Amino acid sequence: HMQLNPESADLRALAKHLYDSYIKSFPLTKAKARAILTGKTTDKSPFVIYDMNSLMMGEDKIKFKHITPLQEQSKEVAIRIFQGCQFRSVEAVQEITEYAKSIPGFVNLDLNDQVTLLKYGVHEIIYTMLASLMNKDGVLISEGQGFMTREFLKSLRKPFGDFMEPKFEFAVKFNALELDDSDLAIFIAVIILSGDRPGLLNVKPIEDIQDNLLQALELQLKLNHPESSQLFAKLLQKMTDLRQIVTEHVQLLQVIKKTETDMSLHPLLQEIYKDLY
């Protein structure tokens, strides 16, 4: 049976440190995102993009961070969307990298191993956190100023219409677990510290930290989800689904490569995907 001893009090201190570091690393938390998704907010109320006419008008009324008046934009809706998403991804790599450095012990890992953990973990974190911004109708965009429907994304010409749908599929199942930010902060730390990433050199200290994180997560979930006996194992299984999501997303990307020319990933994304798997 569970008890309140110096070990558990260390696990909780660890969980709170991750949470605090997570709130200041990631702008739109799932708390704020779900308020928006229910109107339970003041703030703004996002502009809904649900068809081509609302898209055109949304680009005008939403202040997209990456857009300037004006660089050269694709003129084709699907590609302009790809470009915004690629920009958000690059941003997210930096958010996640910063968060990684806040994970006790991470910075003192082999610098080359730090690189490898981020290379493999970043897109699994991206899709993990993207679910915070999704419901079954669509996904929050642009820091929550816009909302793009699932069916609009699905209606983009092939193969762009196939990019987001596997993420929605994942998000429906994953959000039915009802994690909050406090859960998520530990779960993404666990993902970053996967001691089975290809090419790791000094695996021992990585498993040590991941061990300490897996304990802090199990305690976290027992305390925070009284009505969910099998939550810890269900969550670990979701790391399996995320690797599959990343695999599938890679296969669509190479469709883009030998098909859409002019398109090219931001070099940060190119280093990540290069020799991924």
Binding site: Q94, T97, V115, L118, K119, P267, E271, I272
Partner: peptide, 10 residues
Amino acid sequence: RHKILHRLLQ
């Protein structure tokens, strides 16, 4: 190589 990722980490 992962030059940008290396740069971000240092």
